[PDB]
Design a protein around this ligand. Sequence first.
Ligand SMILES: COc1ccncc1CC(=O)N1CCC[C@H](C(N)=O)C1
Ligand SMILES: [Zn+2]
Length: 139
Amino acid sequence: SGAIYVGNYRVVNRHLATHNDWANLVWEDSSRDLLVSSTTAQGCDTIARCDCQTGVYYCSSRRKHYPVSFSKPSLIFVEASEYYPARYQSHLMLAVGHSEPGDCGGILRCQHGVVGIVSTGGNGLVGFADVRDLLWLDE
Ligand SMILES: COc1ccncc1CC(=O)N1CCC[C@H](C(N)=O)C1
Ligand SMILES: [Zn+2]
């Protein structure tokens, strides 16, 4: 689990979203595994507006933060699961690192702020859903 709280928004993995999240839907995108919902409290997370390719992420399956190098956001093929069939997920960034399904939601951070959240993984790889392009999270 895990979410980003910025301003009047909550950013979660679309596969892990709750009933409240859908009842207060702002935006959702299946191809990105992203869901944004409205909140009754003001969020304090800073979203990075950058080109960074290095950061640190939280891996709850290890109770540790890991520094990683990661790829530019792109379309990557993701194996079929119980939430989605076999498809290309967009805005996805891969890194070499420990990952487990319950690890989705873990924040990826750089010097500039929050980059995105854990969304895919397996075989010594971890994939992060990018949120740096969503300029409206600040306006
Ligand atoms: C962090 O997740 C994992 C890590 C290691 N083995 C497996 C996983 C699980 C994973 O990749 N998923 C399953 C749930 C939906 C995901 C998606 N975006 O389509 C894909
Ligand atoms: Zn940055």
